[PDB]
């Protein structure tokens, strides 16, 4: 598993450059804390994101987590970019202040990445109201991530949306504001060809 | 591979080095499975040095007997990556001289490198190692991998093939004396040419 290059780290450290340290940003992932397989980053306020996907180590925990929240295929994630997760946590300014909506997992994850200077505040949201704006948030937003392709079912196996990181930190950003981003546009930081592999290179 | 705080260390230390100054690079180990490498600087004694564990141990083991006489055990614990991480970290349009460009010419072009300029010093067989026995009893300190034993054509033993000692012989042959001095020092810390602590790296 070849992790990013000399090259896409100092790309990587540019690019982040389009990230406000000040501004107020949301941050979800999918999967345990310890074995993510999407990750979003949102500015609602001038529609600046970062989002890219992981490679699972425990395919029968990823296999369940489809399943039953984010309906994933392991075959989409097989040409994700080794190591992009580090590398993106590592690269994120010092003392940034992250929302969230469960900040259990993802303190976690930033410790271990040994980012305990990162802060997580926890928007504190009641399951009745957070998904309040989900189905608007995918009509709108929906063609930003194609790779919820799996059933999701809930406790009475009723058939329901999928999650997708990058849409909740939208959905979220909504409901704290009661009405969906006024935003002429959404960009992600993060080219195609650092999101997945590019073509073969000799790496030593 | 190095992470990001690893690289951006690896950048600030890249500082340490004259882009402009007269510098040797040599390996030892093939030019699409290097197992050393060093980059060193005659007039500051400034240089980098650092190892890899090879892919083909079957040839590794043949370069063991006949050149380098290094051992895979002490290998395993060499950080990976970093031989593409330096050589991209190295400056733009660098020169650098050496003693056998052709290999490392397809080294540094694997790398996407066809910006770094090779020269490759004239220099006789016999010439070239005039300083071997020198440069080993004041630098051999530098470098302790080469415990094995390697032998010539015939079952005659020779001394073995260190890509930091070459450099410096090379250098003592270029100017008919060992290196005028002071201090020399490895930019790369031991932490960064082995493996630190385990990380989480996902
Ligand atoms: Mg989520
Ligand atoms: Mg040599
Ligand atoms: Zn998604
Ligand atoms: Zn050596």
Redesign the interface.
């Known amino acids: 598993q070849?992790?990013?290059?000399?090259?896409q780290?100092?790309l990587?450290?540019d690019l982040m450059g389009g990230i406000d340290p000040n501004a107020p940003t949301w941050i979800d992932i999918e999967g345990r804390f310890?074995?993510?397989v999407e990750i979003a980053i949102f500015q609602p306020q001038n529609g600046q994101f970062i989002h890219f996907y992981?490679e699972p180590v425990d395919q029968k925990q990823f296999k369940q987590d489809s399943k039953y929240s984010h309906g994933m295929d392991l075959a989409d994630l097989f040409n994700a970019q080794p190591?992009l997760?580090?590398?993106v946590?590592?690269?994120l300014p010092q003392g940034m202040v992250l929302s969230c909506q469960g900040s259990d997992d993802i303190r976690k994850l930033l410790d271990?990445?040994?980012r305990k200077d990162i802060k997580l505040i926890d928007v504190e949201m009641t399951r009745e109201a957070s998904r309040e704006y989900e189905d608007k948030v995918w009509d709108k937003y929906g063609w930003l991530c194609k790779m919820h392709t799996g059933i999701v079912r809930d406790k009475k196996k009723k058939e329901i949306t999928p999650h997708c990181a990058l849409m909740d930190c939208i959905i979220f950003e909504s409901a704290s504001k009661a009405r969906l981003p006024d935003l002429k546009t959404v960009h992600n930081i993060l080219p195609h060809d650092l999101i997945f592999r590019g073509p073969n290179?000799?790496?030593?």
């Open positions: 070849v992790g990013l290059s000399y090259s780290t100092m990587l450290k310890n074995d993510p992981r190591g997760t580090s590398s946590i590592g690269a271990s990445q040994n290179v000799v790496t030593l």
